[PDB]
Design a protein around this motif. Structure first.
Motif, mmCIF file in Angstrom:
data_model
loop_
_atom_site.group_PDB
_atom_site.id
_atom_site.type_symbol
_atom_site.label_atom_id
_atom_site.label_comp_id
_atom_site.label_asym_id
_atom_site.label_seq_id
_atom_site.Cartn_x
_atom_site.Cartn_y
_atom_site.Cartn_z
ATOM 1 N N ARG A 134 0.842 -1.187 0.000
ATOM 2 C CA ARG A 134 0.000 0.000 0.000
ATOM 3 C C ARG A 134 0.879 1.240 0.000
ATOM 4 N NH1 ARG A 134 -1.986 -0.492 4.647
ATOM 5 N NH2 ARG A 134 -0.813 1.132 5.763
ATOM 6 N N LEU A 135 0.572 2.188 -0.884
ATOM 7 C CA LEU A 135 1.472 3.314 -1.088
ATOM 8 C C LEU A 135 0.761 4.657 -0.950
ATOM 9 C CD1 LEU A 135 1.192 4.363 -4.448
ATOM 10 C CD2 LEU A 135 2.040 2.027 -4.650
ATOM 11 N N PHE A 136 -0.352 4.698 -0.223
ATOM 12 C CA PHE A 136 -0.964 5.964 0.151
ATOM 13 C C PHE A 136 -1.019 6.067 1.665
ATOM 14 C CE2 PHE A 136 -5.148 4.494 1.567
ATOM 15 C CZ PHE A 136 -5.290 3.293 0.911
ATOM 16 N N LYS A 137 -0.857 7.283 2.173
ATOM 17 C CA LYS A 137 -1.125 7.533 3.580
ATOM 18 C C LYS A 137 -2.630 7.569 3.799
ATOM 19 C CE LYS A 137 -0.705 11.389 5.704
ATOM 20 N NZ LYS A 137 -1.923 11.155 6.526
ATOM 21 N N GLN A 166 -1.989 6.130 -7.966
ATOM 22 C CA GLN A 166 -1.880 4.721 -7.622
ATOM 23 C C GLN A 166 -2.137 4.507 -6.135
ATOM 24 O OE1 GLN A 166 2.003 3.090 -8.132
ATOM 25 N NE2 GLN A 166 1.333 0.957 -7.972
ATOM 26 N N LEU A 167 -2.757 3.374 -5.811
ATOM 27 C CA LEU A 167 -3.042 3.015 -4.428
ATOM 28 C C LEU A 167 -2.322 1.753 -3.990
ATOM 29 C CD1 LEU A 167 -6.852 3.815 -4.366
ATOM 30 C CD2 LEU A 167 -4.911 5.299 -3.902
ATOM 31 N N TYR A 168 -2.470 0.657 -4.727
ATOM 32 C CA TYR A 168 -1.808 -0.593 -4.395
ATOM 33 C C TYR A 168 -1.196 -1.214 -5.639
ATOM 34 C CZ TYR A 168 -5.291 -0.340 -0.588
ATOM 35 O OH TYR A 168 -6.100 0.071 0.439
ATOM 36 N N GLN A 169 -0.140 -1.988 -5.407
ATOM 37 C CA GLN A 169 0.442 -2.885 -6.392
ATOM 38 C C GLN A 169 0.004 -4.303 -6.058
ATOM 39 O OE1 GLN A 169 3.120 -1.971 -9.126
ATOM 40 N NE2 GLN A 169 1.629 -3.567 -9.627
ATOM 41 N N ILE A 170 -0.499 -5.029 -7.051
ATOM 42 C CA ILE A 170 -1.093 -6.333 -6.792
ATOM 43 C C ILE A 170 -0.253 -7.465 -7.395
ATOM 44 C CG2 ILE A 170 -3.384 -7.320 -6.392
ATOM 45 C CD1 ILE A 170 -4.616 -4.975 -7.677
ATOM 46 N N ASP A 171 1.089 -7.294 -7.445
ATOM 47 C CA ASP A 171 2.075 -8.329 -7.775
ATOM 48 C C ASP A 171 1.792 -9.009 -9.109
ATOM 49 O OD1 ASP A 171 4.435 -9.958 -6.748
ATOM 50 O OD2 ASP A 171 2.978 -11.557 -7.100
ATOM 51 N N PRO A 172 2.093 -8.355 -10.251
ATOM 52 C CA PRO A 172 1.538 -8.802 -11.540
ATOM 53 C C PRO A 172 1.915 -10.214 -11.971
ATOM 54 C CG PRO A 172 3.290 -7.176 -11.850
ATOM 55 C CD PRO A 172 2.986 -7.194 -10.394
ATOM 56 N N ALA A 173 3.189 -10.463 -12.285
ATOM 57 C CA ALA A 173 3.837 -11.777 -12.322
ATOM 58 C C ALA A 173 3.270 -12.794 -13.317
ATOM 59 C CB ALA A 173 3.822 -12.393 -10.922
ATOM 60 N N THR A 174 2.097 -12.532 -13.881
ATOM 61 C CA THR A 174 1.430 -13.242 -14.962
ATOM 62 C C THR A 174 1.125 -12.299 -16.106
ATOM 63 O OG1 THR A 174 -0.928 -12.868 -14.609
ATOM 64 C CG2 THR A 174 0.155 -14.298 -13.056
#
Lengths: 52, 53
Positions: free
Chosen positions: A1-4, A14-22
């Motif tokens: 999570r990258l927002f305060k 952007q709010l979250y990164q959901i680990d793309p990987a596919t």
């Protein structure tokens, strides 16, 4: 999570990164197909002027 | 008698040759129409042109 939390955010932030990987993998596959077909299209564009 | 044989045969030989040249000319015309439409390239026009003469 990258927002305060509890802050004001603008649209498109952007709010979250959901680990793309596919999606990264299928994006690499689609770009690998694009790197072939675009230079084939450019070579045919060059050769179609002389009616070869 | 050999001259009579050559007279009897060379007319039909050149008839076959003229029909062959006619078939090659129709082939070249169809290849030219196919080229000017845009279906095939200049290579398969040129080889039919070669076959013609």
């Amino acid at each position: 999570r990258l927002f305060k939390e509890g802050s004001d955010v603008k649209a498109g932030q952007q709010l979250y990164q959901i680990d793309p990987a596919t999606y990264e993998a299928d994006y690499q596959s689609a770009q690998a197909n694009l790197a072939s077909t675009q230079e084939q299209a450019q070579r045919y564009k060059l050769l179609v002027a002389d009616q070869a | 008698a050999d001259g009579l044989a050559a007279r009897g045969t060379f007319t039909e030989q050149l008839q076959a040759q003229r029909d062959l040249v006619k078939a090659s000319d129709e082939y070249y015309q169809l290849a030219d129409k196919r080229y000017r439409t845009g279906v095939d390239n200049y290579l398969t026009l040129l080889d039919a042109q070669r076959s013609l003469f």
